[PDB]
Nucleic acid binder design. Structure first.
Length: 404
RNA sequence: CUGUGAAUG
C-alpha cells in the first residue's frame, strides 16, 4: 500500500482516484474493502467517470482486477454503477466492456474469479449486449473444456438461465453430438450443464411466458437433444453422473413422451441387469414410479416372468432382485406402488381401461412371495420394510438369467 | 442390509 495513505481515516475516494494508485488498493485485502464501501456512497459525476476509466476502461487493468481474488468484486460493483448511470457515455461504456470480455472470453470463463465477472455481466447487461457475449464463446474442443470446468460450467448454466435460446442454440447441438455428449455427460460438472439445458428446454410452468414461436424453437431443440440422449441412454443410465439425467427425464411429468421412449428403448428387457447396478438401479426405481400404466404392466411382467429360473436352484429374477444389495430398492418400489394403488393413494385409469385389477394381481404375486420368504426377509432392513408395508395394508384394507 | 451428483472476500 502506498505510504501517502497509511490507512488514514480521513482518506477520501477522490484522493485514491486522483493518485493513480487505485490498482494498488484494489488488489489489497484492506484496500478493496475501502473501495467497496466508497463506491456504495453518493458518487459525483467525476468520481464515476474516474471509476469507469480506471476499473472497466483499461483492458489490462480490467483483466488483472477481474482475475483477482479481491478485485473481481470491485469490477462487478463498477459494472453495476456503469449500468445504472444513464449519462451520455452509457452506450460507449457498455460497448467497451462487451469488447473487453469478448476478446478474452475463454480465459475469463476458466478463471475462478473472472468467471464471476462474466456471470454478473450476462444477467445485468442490457439483453442485446449480453447476447453479444454469448457469441464470443468458442466452438471447438475449448467448449468441451468449458462445460466440464469447475468454474466455467456455471458460465454456460448462466447463459441458459438468462439469455433467450436463439442465442445459444449452437450449444444444444454441440452437446448433442454423440462424441461430445459422452464426454460432457459423464463428467461431474458437464452433467449439471446438460441437466440445466434439458430443464430450460422443457415446457413446464416456468416457460409459459414464451411466445408460440419461441415454444416451437424450444421444442425442436428439445427433440434434437432427446434423440442423442435416448440413443446412448444405456451408457448414460449406468454412469455415476449421467444417471441423474436419465432419472430427470423419466420422472419429469412435462417430459412424459420421452419417459416412455427411454423406458422402451433402454430399460425394457434389461431390468434384471440394471436393477443390480449401483447407479442404474435408481433409474429403474424412477421408471417404475412414473411409467404409464400400459408400460408398467410390461415392466411388472418382465420381473415376474421375463426370465427363466436358474436350472440348478430354481432362483428366479424376483428372488435375485429381492435379496440384492441394490435390487431390493426396486422390489420395495414395486410393492409400494401396488399398495398405493389398491389403497387409493394412486389412480389406476388409463387409455380406456381401469388397471385396478392389474395392480391387484401384482400385489398378490408380491404378497405371496414375501409371505413364503418371510423368514429370510426378516434378516434384512429391506425385508422388514416389505413385511411392514404389507402389514400396514392388511390393517387399513450381479447374477443374470436367461431372458424369455 | 442397506445404495450415487457444482466453483470466489
Amino acid at each position: 500500500l502506498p505510504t501517502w495513505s497509511l490507512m488514514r481515516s480521513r482518506l477520501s475516494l477522490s484522493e485514491v482516484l486522483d493518485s493513480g494508485d487505485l490498482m494498488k488498493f484494489a488488489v489489497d485485502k484492506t484496500g478493496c474493502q475501502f473501495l467497496e464501501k466508497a463506491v456504495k456512497g453518493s458518487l459525483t459525476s467525476y468520481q464515476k467517470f474516474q471509476l469507469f476509466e480506471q476499473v472497466i476502461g483499461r483492458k489490462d487493468d480490467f483483466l488483472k482486477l477481474s482475475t483477482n481474488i479481491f478485485g473481481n468484486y470491485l469490477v462487478q460493483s463498477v459494472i453495476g454503477i456503469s449500468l445504472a448511470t444513464n449519462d451520455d457515455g452509457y452506450t460507449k461504456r457498455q460497448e467497451k466492456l462487451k469488447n473487453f470480455i469478448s476478446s478474452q472470453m475463454t480465459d475469463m470463463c476458466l478463471d475462478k474469479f473472472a468467471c464471476r465477472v462474466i456471470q454478473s455481466s450476462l444477467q445485468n447487461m442490457d439483453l442485446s449486449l449480453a447476447c453479444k457475449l454469448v457469441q464470443a464463446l468458442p466452438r471447438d474442443a475449448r467448449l468441451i473444456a468449458i462445460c466440464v470446468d469447475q468454474n466455467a460450467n456455471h458460465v454456460i448454466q448462466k447463459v441458459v438461465a438468462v439469455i433467450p435460446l436463439k442465442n445459444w442454440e449452437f450449444i444444444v447441438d454441440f452437446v448433442a453430438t454423440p462424441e461430445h455428449l459422452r464426454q460432457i455427460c459423464s463428467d461431474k460438472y458437464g452433467c449439471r450443464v446438460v441437466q440445466t439445458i434439458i430443464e430450460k428446454l422443457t415446457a413446464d410452468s416456468m416457460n409459459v411466458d414464451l411466445t408460440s414461436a419461441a415454444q416451437n424453437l424450444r421444442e425442436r431443440a428439445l427433440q434434437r437433444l432427446m434423440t442423442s440422449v435416448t440413443n446412448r441412454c444405456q451408457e448414460l443410465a449406468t454412469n455415476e453422473y449421467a444417471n441423474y439425467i436419465i432419472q430427470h427425464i423419466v420422472s419429469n411429468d412435462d417430459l412424459a413422451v420421452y419417459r416412455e421412449c427411454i423406458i422402451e428403448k433402454c430399460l425394457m428387457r434389461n431390468l434384471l441387469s440394471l436393477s443390480q447396478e449401483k447407479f442404474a438401479s435408481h433409474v429403474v426405481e424412477k421408471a417404475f414410479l412414473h411409467a404409464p400404466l400400459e408400460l408398467l404392466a410390461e415392466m411388472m411382467d418382465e420381473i415376474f416372468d421375463g426370465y427363466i429360473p436358474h436350472p440348478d436352484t430354481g432362483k428366479d429374477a424376483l428372488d435375485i432382485m429381492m435379496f440384492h444389495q441394490f435390487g431390493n430398492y426396486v422390489v420395495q418400489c414395486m410393492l409400494t406402488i401396488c399398495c398405493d394403488a389398491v389403497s387409493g393413494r394412486r389412480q389406476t385409469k388409463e387409455g380406456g381401461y381401469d388397471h385396478a385389477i392389474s395392480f391387484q394381481d401384482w400385489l398378490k404375486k408380491l404378497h405371496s412371495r414375501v409371505t413364503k420368504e418371510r423368514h429370510r426377509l426378516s434378516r434384512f432392513s429391506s425385508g422388514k420394510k416389505m413385511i411392514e408395508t404389507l402389514a400396514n395394508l392388511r390393517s387399513t384394507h450381479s447374477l443374470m438369467l436367461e431372458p424369455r
